[PDB]
Amino acid sequence: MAVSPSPLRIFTAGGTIDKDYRLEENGLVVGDPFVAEVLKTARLAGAVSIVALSRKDFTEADREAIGRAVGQAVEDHILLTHGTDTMVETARYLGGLPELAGKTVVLSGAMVPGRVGGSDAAFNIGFACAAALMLAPGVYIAMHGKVFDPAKTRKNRGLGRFEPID
Amino acid sequence: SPLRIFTAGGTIDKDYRLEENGLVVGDPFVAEVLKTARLAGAVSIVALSRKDSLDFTEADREAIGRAVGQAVEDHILLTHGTDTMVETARYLGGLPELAGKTVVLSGAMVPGRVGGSDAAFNIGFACAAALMLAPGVYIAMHGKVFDPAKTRKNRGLGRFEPI
Amino acid sequence: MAVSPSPLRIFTAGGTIDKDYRLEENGLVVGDPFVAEVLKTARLAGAVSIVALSRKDFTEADREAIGRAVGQAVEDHILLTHGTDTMVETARYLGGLPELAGKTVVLSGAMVPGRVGGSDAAFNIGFACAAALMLAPGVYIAMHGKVFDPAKTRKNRGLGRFEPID
Amino acid sequence: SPLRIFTAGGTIDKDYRLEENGLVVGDPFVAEVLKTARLAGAVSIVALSRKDSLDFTEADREAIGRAVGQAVEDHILLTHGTDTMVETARYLGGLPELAGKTVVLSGAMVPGRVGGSDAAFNIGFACAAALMLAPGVYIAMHGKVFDPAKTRKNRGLGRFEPI
Ligand SMILES: [Cl-]
Ligand SMILES: [Cl-]
């Protein structure tokens, strides 16, 4: 004999999930992709191709590059790790790209950096990988153990969570 | 829809005890993972057993089947030892009582309280599997969904594999 | 049976060692004292009284309060957890207080927050506790597995370490 | 002055192995702690043994004594199992060859690779003890310095205590 397929590709675009301390900045910067650290110890049957697109906390040019990389990917199952502050805008933009029509594209990340104690990151990565493999084609946000429709979602700062727009 | 989580012990929950000079099955690790998961939805955890999975009898499996049957929830995650996860999953897949439920078994090759554990990833993956898969019994391990009737644990590889 | 003594008192004055992520700030703040977390699992024979003096990354009034608390303590073995950026100035100020004459006073902390992966904090706390119990009376900085004389020490940003002044 | 660290295994270094379905003595945990300690001074680590301390013979202790004697350094940390740390420390305290050295034995009640371990604190404490104490053999555990000839492990308390 069997060959394990690798149907999921992951793109990383920085965000809180990848933040790490630097002595020079005397605080957090966007560091290496934390999803690579989670998948290293996941004992995967197959593998996951992880490609770093950008390392920002994020411009219109950056958004455009993400659409191109996702659209040019061979895989039909895609996970994009990203900051939560701009996740709805990125997700809605990807939603409007005809070339994504047959792909399941999930955005996720973490409210707490993976490299800070008490982070949601590893759970979110596991949930978002499953989501990207199991959901019908579309663009989704997977956070809080839930799937969100980008056109009907906002980040509620007071809650500290994404919430649906009724 | 509401997820119900049942804990049957196993490697995922193992923790060090001075008295034993080694690992024992401790408190359920899934509770530690979900505490920091910032969940939006309805979830509840129920402790069933703190055995090592090798020590399960026909009667431990019988009791697990009836316990899962007591849950009105249609989405079920059962955390369990990998050594007899296929036997429990096959047993549950044979119970007509459970046929409308999505039941996902998962756990970890390395205890969650040991460095470098698969446990958190596996819990996130299995929670999504329990919510997204059609009714049936499944093993969710290694970033994959296994059909219990067509799966074995391969000790040489340290993974479940298809038959 | 015997009664275990508690000869060490710890005062906390914030600093990098205690920094923790907050969703509201979208970055690090000075959080709860990390030394309390290290001592919780240290399986101490006796105990350590830990008193929080301040939570700053730090004014002249704050420096004065530290001198008062250290001087009024019953214990002759004192550990002050603190930011590294102002540690030499605090240490030199404590050095000039006659009321500290019979006390062993050690300042320490961490170049990386205790709640960030790959932190020096737990090692530094163990080393600094021993230092505060074992050194002769005086004021010291314990970092990098070494004891520094405050009057002959500077923080070298390029090295990322304290270094002696030759 | 230069510290030399010798590793003799024990609980501090235990790690989970799929093949054993449990803990084995693994790679020395002191190396993991010192990697992130941002040390200023001269330190070197030497592996002596990967036994569980219960399994030490008169000959394992003999070999440890001669190995510590091979170090020109006067400041020595030996990481070790707690179950026979008093026997090794008493043995070393009887060797005239070592009488100019400060030799500190330490370890952990909980493996460093298990959550909630004393190991990192104990390593920092013991490094300072090895640098600061007068020549002699000492156990540094529980934020305290023990005289080996006047110490026992109390299994009821889970700590070393004075006699
Ligand atoms: Cl920051
Ligand atoms: Cl074990």
Residue numbers in the entry:
A (entry chain A), C (entry chain A): 1 to 57, 61 to 169
B (entry chain B), D (entry chain B): 6 to 168
Quoted passage from the original study:
In contrast, the chain of ASNase from Rhodospirillum rubrum, reported here and referred to as RrA, consists of only 172 amino acid residues.
In the structure of the ligand‐free enzyme, residues 58–60 of protomer A were not traced due to the lack of interpretable electron density. The two protomers form a tight dimer (designated AB in the structure) with an interface area of approximately 1100 Å2. The tetramer was created by 2‐fold crystal symmetry, with intermolecular contacts observed only between protomers A‐A' and B‐B′, yielding an interface area of around 625 Å2 for each pair. However, the corresponding loop in RrA remains fully ordered regardless of the active site occupancy, and its temperature factors are comparable to those of the rest of the protein chain. Despite the overall low sequence identity between RrA and typical class 1 ASNases, here represented by EcAII, the environment of L‐Asp bound to the active site is very similar for both enzymes. As previously mentioned, Thr16 (presumed to be the primary nucleophile in RrA) remains well ordered even in the absence of a substrate.
